[PDB]
């Protein structure tokens, strides 16, 4: 069982800022990780997969990276359509398995 | 384009049992793998189980296996998921996704 540990609950940050949310992987998951933004009253937006390729509409201000057992996200200008949770998703091996989430607030 | 409806809401009694919709659309249905997860308030997702349409074939997670069933009815695009047994800790958001598409929940009550 794949566990996936988020580096904060909350995180503050006012716009213009860069954020780095981590996610650490209990075991070696190679790259199959996805981040997912879910804004409150609605479904999770893809963000990431394949650890750092972005998903068909995703702004540049958005970078994933890692592999192994460390992932990253991150934000190098944050807007305000940016404050949202984040989470981050293994894919190698079931059953899959999400991180708890970040906050992100101002 | 490719859309997951799920009906909105749904109130159920304690004990009983409740079938959940996810019709697909925009898409041929049978060449993605259906993904169910719930979510509570309090805690993050969690990933229930999941469905190839083509031949039904299923994996779930072992906390969910006995309490939960994943369908398909290929004539009509849909997928159903059916709880039993429900109690108060079954009420949360439940959506139905597949890559790069989430429907938008179905909130489960128990009352």
């Known amino acids: 069982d794949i566990v996936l540990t988020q580096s904060h609950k909350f995180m503050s940050t006012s716009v213009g800022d860069r954020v780095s949310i981590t996610c650490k992987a209990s075991?070696?998951?190679?790259?199959?990780v996805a981040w997912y933004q879910q804004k409150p009253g609605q479904s999770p937006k893809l963000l990431i997969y394949?650890?750092?390729t972005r998903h068909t509409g995703v702004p540049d201000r958005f970078t994933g990276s890692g592999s192994g057992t460390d992932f990253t996200l991150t934000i190098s200008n944050v807007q305000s359509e940016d404050l949202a949770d984040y989470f981050c998703?293994?894919?190698?091996?079931?059953?899959?398995?999400f991180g708890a989430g970040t906050k992100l607030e101002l | 384009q490719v859309q997951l409806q799920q009906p909105g809401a749904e109130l159920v009694r304690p004990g009983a049992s409740v079938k959940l919709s996810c019709k697909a659309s925009?898409?041929?249905?049978?060449?993605?793998?259906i993904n169910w997860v719930k979510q509570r308030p309090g805690q993050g997702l969690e990933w229930i189980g999941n469905?190839?349409?083509?031949?039904?074939?299923?994996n779930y997670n072992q906390k969910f296996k006995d309490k939960a069933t994943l369908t398909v009815d290929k004539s009509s695009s849909t997928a159903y998921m059916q709880l039993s047994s429900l109690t108060s800790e079954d009420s949360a958001v439940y959506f139905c996704?597949?890559?790069?598409?989430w429907g938008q929940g179905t909130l489960v009550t128990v009352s």
């Open positions: 998703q293994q894919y190698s091996s079931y059953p899959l398995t």
């Open positions: 996704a597949r890559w790069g598409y």
């Open positions: 925009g898409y041929t249905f049978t060449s993605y793998w």
């Open positions: 469905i190839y349409p083509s031949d039904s074939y299923t």
């Open positions: 394949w650890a750092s």
């Open positions: 075991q070696d998951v190679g790259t199959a």
